[PDB]
Structure 1
């Protein structure tokens, strides 16, 4: 191996399905090209500005081989640090550098790490509908495909305030009622267990919809249905309340897709407050920190379920599968089938087979972006009205 000099950096935003996806491309003098995921779907222009105007100038000319040095350097380069815009931009670079390294090594990404500790990673997918029969329809399709884990949600939560006990002139927003949401969810679980028994593991995402007193009540009530995990039962700033849950419920908990600061997860993990870490890999700054966090979780007996919803490139998905077949404490990979457009922008994107995702076996990450093809689906402004989530009295709640 000789020095590998960075020659150019690109940042591409594309929207082949419903979400703005962000890819970073790192070119080298040596003609070895790396690809990485930088997807912060809600603010893609801010991530692209970050890469183009700020990371590019500090990276051109540097030796790509020293990923660790470059990561440490990038993370503190703006002085102020740790956030979703900065970390996503860095992730795109970090993943691309790992891609370049694996290509130079002539190895699949996970082989650099130390290779496999499992044959493939199990997958769970999403069944959400306003009717139980909609859920049943989705569930039965997934079971036919060999899925053994399904995240189920009954009802949609966020609409006009008129349906609720609201005030005389409600502030504009996406309204919901926490009690209605909990009641529907418990009914859903009961119905699913009566209908399917233990045919599949049921997951559910509380999505920080609750106050702490509601969260603990919900944990106790849902316990009997033995969810594989209940996800984001609290927002990231009230996880200290997990202690009271852990002292009286055996419910399995996943949390962390929101994290972009180590102080959000350090005490959480050291105190065993969760069972599955859920971080979005690009939010914490890429592969480099994901390995370390995986190892931290291993020490404390916490398993890994990285956030892998559709708001991420198939490049990012492939990276997570490499991480997932390598880290011994990886548990499961979230997945939603890719549409035709996405498959076209990112060739060779793996889909699950009989409920398992297999890591790519060519050199590198295994998935790149077709640039000229990404341009057909340009960045789209989206209001994301659901993030203006309000309770009946009109107050914002964490969405």
Structure 2
């Protein structure tokens, strides 16, 4: 029985900062986890340091599901969504990494097999609310040349205190990207919560005219009713879930009318949680298309899960500035011929440059 000796919560400067969890077992082997670095992930890290670490230390790696579910019911009044679920997700991923090393198996081999070990990417391109038409086109062309993606998603990342800011301008941007990519290109559009119901419908119809494949988070994530209503009113596939943090809330998103869900493995659930979400998606007949923006640990957890997904429909997300995986990681997310290559090393198979890490890492400690 392999025991957890130590749990460390680490804020790490990259390439912006990331939030990692390093769990050292009693035998000296090491597991890596990642929490969504929202405002640096500092809050999630504190929670790991103050609440999760003292509980997990002395306990057994293979009890990971029971340990973390119990931890979540202990942290439930912390939300738990967002900060607590990222903290838990991070620890889940670190324990799976440790589990894979203890058992001598890559994670997908512990999960019942991969349908594929080469997974198509899609270029996820943010910051388009602030760009001119021509800057949007330039950035798309620049990333498409470098990544050879199977699809492209243009995200707005606008100011969520404002609604329906520039509908004609957003449509003009989507038009110009369609003209750039040609008529057969698979294109997604991420509104980042930019629209009212009426505004989302107006944009969706224009996206339908331009042949777009999906329409991501058209309304505020807290209007679940409206999200599903827009989903059911439009032909273009409305997608949401990256700001959904529980299995039950995911269930409710589906019931609202969403047919493509996107929970994130470092925002919630970790490997265990995400496998549960995939089963729920398959039970209801909805597409499962995870949100993932981190080039190292999160990406590896993401692709282990996705290799197990039978009815994979869209490609793996490749977000902006993935080059920031270096130099902390030696093998971070990097597409070859438009695909991610999943290897067979035990655990995650993430390779960490330990001396670069330490020079860039700051431990978050009880306080």
Q: Distance in 2 between matches of 1:378 and 1:364?
A: 22
Larger Rg: 1
TM alignment of 1:366-385, pairs within 5 A:
366-377=349-360
TM alignment of 1:286-301, pairs within 5 A:
286-301=270-285
Residue in 2 that maps onto 1:326: 308
Residue in 2 that maps onto 1:241: 226
Q: Distance in 2 between matches of 1:244 and 1:345?
A: 43
The 1:364/1:261 distance shift into structure 2, 3 A limit, reads closer
TM alignment of 1:165-180, pairs within 5 A:
178-180=164-166
Deviation at 1:317, TM superposition (A): 0.7
Residue in 1 that maps onto 2:98: 100
Deviation at 1:246, TM superposition (A): 4.1
Residue in 1 that maps onto 2:69: 72
Q: Distance in 2 between matches of 1:283 and 1:175?
A: 22
Residue in 2 that maps onto 1:121: 119
TM-score normalised to the size of structure 2?
Answer: 0.88
For the residue of structure 2 that corresponds to 1:185, the secondary structure is helix
Q: Distance in 2 between matches of 1:47 and 1:244?
A: 33
Whether contact under 8 Å (1:6, 1:60) holds in the other structure is yes
TM-score normalised to the size of structure 1?
Answer: 0.81
Whether contact under 8 Å (1:314, 1:367) holds in the other structure is yes
Q: Distance in 2 between matches of 1:258 and 1:227?
A: 22
Q: Distance in 2 between matches of 1:48 and 1:243?
A: 33
The 1:241/1:351 distance shift into structure 2, 3 A limit, reads same
For the residue of structure 2 that corresponds to 1:362, the secondary structure is coil
Residue in 1 that maps onto 2:24: 27
Whether contact under 8 Å (1:91, 1:282) holds in the other structure is yes
Deviation at 1:30, TM superposition (A): 2.2
Q: Distance in 2 between matches of 1:201 and 1:227?
A: 7
Question: CA deviation digits over 1:74-117, x for unaligned, max 9?
Answer: 11123525222211111121111111111122111111101111
Whether contact under 8 Å (1:315, 1:368) holds in the other structure is no
- Alignment partner of 1:364 is 2:341: no
Residue in 1 that maps onto 2:148: 146
Out of 299, 303, 318, the position equivalent to 2:287 is 303
Deviation at 1:326, TM superposition (A): 1.1
Deviation at 1:65, TM superposition (A): 1.0
Aligned residues: 356
Q: Distance in 2 between matches of 1:44 and 1:335?
A: 20
Deviation at 1:338, TM superposition (A): 5.2
* Root-mean-square deviation over aligned CA pairs: 2.4
Q: Which moved more, 1:6-15 or 1:261-270?
A: 261-270
Q: Distance in 1 between matches of 2:102 and 2:3?
A: 13
Out of 33, 48, 63, the position equivalent to 1:36 is 33
Question: CA deviation digits over 1:51-89, x for unaligned, max 9?
Answer: 112111111111111222112211112352522221111
Q: Distance in 1 between matches of 2:227 and 2:137?
A: 32
Whether contact under 8 Å (2:98, 2:347) holds in the other structure is yes
Runs of 4+ in 1 over 6 A off after TM superposition: none
For the residue of structure 1 that corresponds to 2:21, the secondary structure is strand
- Alignment partner of 1:203 is 2:181: no
Deviation at 1:371, TM superposition (A): 4.5
Q: Distance in 1 between matches of 2:180 and 2:24?
A: 53
Q: Which runs of 5+ in 1 are unaligned?
A: 159-173, 380-399
The 1:87/1:339 distance shift into structure 2, 3 A limit, reads closer
Whether contact under 8 Å (1:38, 1:91) holds in the other structure is yes
